[PDB]
């Protein structure tokens, strides 16, 4: 129906991963700046496509020193589409960043999963946003 | 009025920060590749939203070795929305990168500020662009 | 004609650069996830603008340890518009990332070129996507 669809969420705290997050390995975002269409489930940090079309996605997952290197991936219905990486050192914060355009059908689910390493020490300043570029008949 | 709004600017030189830039901590971009709507003030390196809607922003701030780590932030009317970080070493250039979708009202101002560290040694190859995803009634 | 234009391609293998890639220094993407309008030449990894308008581009070129630092650039008809950099170490994968909005005329060619260093060891997980923001009369 609506051709105006976009979401944007950020991690605004250094707080540690939850017990459920330790299980699902899905990255949570507490603050949702944008959510037109209400298609982003903030409770599960997942975007569900309301219709067929081309969707844009971008993420930047920031971490601190924690004796661990990480690999983040954008999951599409349980399968990784793109991935990003970050090293580990006590000099500065570093980010695993990537973006992509993909075709999603109505009901397709998009979310970020931590494939390697952990986010102990928090992942403040992390970002995850997306929008509908255009629908498809 | 116009639903076609986008800007794109780059730093095309290794030249040092200005005296005024040393005061405002705002990151300047000398070369403006795109500026449809003329809503980007190149003199102040700030984007002023012409109307209510969802806007996309992306930036990549590149630096060189200068004994300093930096923190860059996208400011919305003086308040930081998102941030990015870069270490410091004499091996290669590195970039503080991030992006986000946000809702802006008519008159809202968007720009990049250097919250920590300095850009002594220039910040060539740096980028800052944005566009109107869609307006809101 | 069509105002719906977007492409998205990824590198899905650690395989080494080809003999022809060693000559052109152009970065190849074997898997094309999106190609609405069919304006992206997968054989040459180049996007040809079908009409006048503002186009968005984003790329993330991932590499491994190979005793080499790299510089990647988005070429517009043989000239670099933006650039990105990545160091070199055996700790983790790292990415040269950047994005930009640019005005392209009908026939203008956009592609990624490796200006410095090599991608020996493969460039798996690399991404390159773009879309038409809006056309211009
Ligand atoms: C999650 O796992 C880490 C180990 O990687 C552990 O230190 C932490 O306490 C766990 N968090 C919870 C809430 O159980
Ligand atoms: C800006 O401040 C730096 C110190 O961080 C100084 O070295 C530089 O000369 C200053 N630039 C100007 C134009 O005053
Ligand atoms: C490309 O050049 C590298 C040297 O940088 C060489 O090791 C490699 O074998 C070359 N690839 C081909 C296919 O010739």
CA-to-CA dists, residue C37 to A19, B104, C31, C52, C74, angstroms: 45, 32, 17, 14, 21
> Residue C95 CB: number of other CB atoms within 10 A?
27
C-alpha–C-alpha distance, residues A85 and A71, integer Å: 5
Please choose, from the candidates B53, B58, B56, B57, the residue with its C-alpha nearest in 3D space to the C-alpha of residue B106.
B53
Do residues A83 and A117 lie in contact, with contact meaning Cβ atoms separated by under 8 Å?
Answer: no
Q: Domain segments of chain B: what residues?
A: 1-137
The token pair at C9 is: 């391609």
Method underlying the structure:
X-ray
DSSP B60-106: EEEE--SS--EEEEEEETTEEEEEEEE---SSS-EEEEEEEEEEE-T
C-alpha–C-alpha distance, residues C13 and C125, integer Å: 8
CA-to-CA dists, residue B129 to B53, B59, B91, B104, angstroms: 16, 6, 28, 15
The token pair at B30 is: 């000398």
Q: Is C91 exposed, middle or buried (0-12, 13-18, 19+ CB in 10 A)?
A: exposed
CA–CA min distance B79, chain C (Å): 24
Residue B17 in contact with ligand 2 by CB distance below 6 A? yes
- Phi-psi bin for C4: left (phi > 0), alpha (psi -120 to 50), beta? beta
CA–CA min distance B65, chain C (Å): 13
Q: How far apart are the first and last CA of chain A?
A: 12
Instruction: Say whether A24 sits in a helix, a strand or coil.
Output: helix
Q: Which residues of C36-47 are buried (b: 16+ CB within 10 A; e: fewer)?
A: bbebbeeeebeb
Q: Report how far ligand 2's centroid is from the alpha carbon of B19 (Å).
A: 7
Give the list of residues 6+ apart from residue B43 with CB closer than 8 angstroms, or none.
none
Q: Which residues pair with C26 in a beta bridge?
A: C113
Do residues A53 and A59 lie in contact, with contact meaning Cβ atoms separated by under 8 Å?
Answer: no
CA-to-CA dists, residue A79 to A44, A56, C66, angstroms: 17, 17, 29
Residue C118 in contact with ligand 3 by CB distance below 6 A? yes
Q: Show the 3-state SS of B8-53.
A: EEECCCCCCCCCCHHHHCECCCCEEEEEECCCEECCCCEEECCCCE
CA-to-CA dists, residue A98 to A40, A88, B114, angstroms: 19, 18, 23
CA-to-CA dists, residue A37 to A7, A47, A74, angstroms: 8, 11, 21
Q: Judged by CB atoms within 8 Å, which residues 60-99 of C form the interface with B?
A: 69, 81-88, 97-99
Query: How far is C-alpha C34 from the chain's CA centre?
Result: 14
For the CA atoms of C75, C76, C78, C83, what is the dihedral angle to 10 degrees?
-30
Q: Report how far ligand 1's centroid is from the alpha carbon of C5 (Å).
A: 45
C-alpha–C-alpha distance, residues A2 and B43, integer Å: 38
Q: Which residues of A58-91 are buried (b: 16+ CB within 10 A; e: fewer)?
A: bbbbbbbeeeebbbbbbbbeeeebbbbbbbbeee
> Residue A38 CB: number of other CB atoms within 10 A?
11
Give the list of residues 6+ apart from residue C50 with CB closer than 8 angstroms, or none.
C1, C2, C5, C37, C39, C106
Sheet of strand C94-104: strand arrangement: C31-36, C6-10, C127-135, C53-63, C94-104
The token pair at A137 is: 């008949």
Instruction: Say whether A22 sits in a helix, a strand or coil.
Output: helix
Length of chain B, in residues: 137
Reported resolution in A? 2.4
Q: Which CATH number fits domain C1-137: 3.30.565.10, 2.60.40.10, 2.60.120.40, 2.70.160.11?
A: 2.60.120.40
């Amino acid at each position: 129906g609506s051709a105006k669809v976009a979401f944007s969420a950020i991690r605004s705290t250094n707080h540690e991963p939850s017990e459920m997050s330790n299980r699902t390995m899905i990255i949570y975002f507490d603050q949702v700046l944008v959510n037109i269409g209400n298609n982003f489930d903030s409770e599960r940090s997942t975007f569900i496509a309301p219709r067929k079309g081309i969707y844009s996605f971008n993420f930047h997952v920031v971490k601190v020193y924690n004796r661990q290197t990480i690999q983040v991936s954008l999951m599409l219905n349980g399968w990784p589409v793109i991935s990003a990486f970050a090293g580990d050192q006590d000099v500065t914060r570093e980010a695993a960043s990537n973006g992509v355009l993909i075709q999603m059908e109505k009901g397709d689910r998009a979310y970020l999963k931590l494939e390697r390493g952990n986010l102990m020490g928090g992942w403040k300043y992390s970002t995850f946003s997306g929008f509908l570029v255009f629908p498809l008949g």
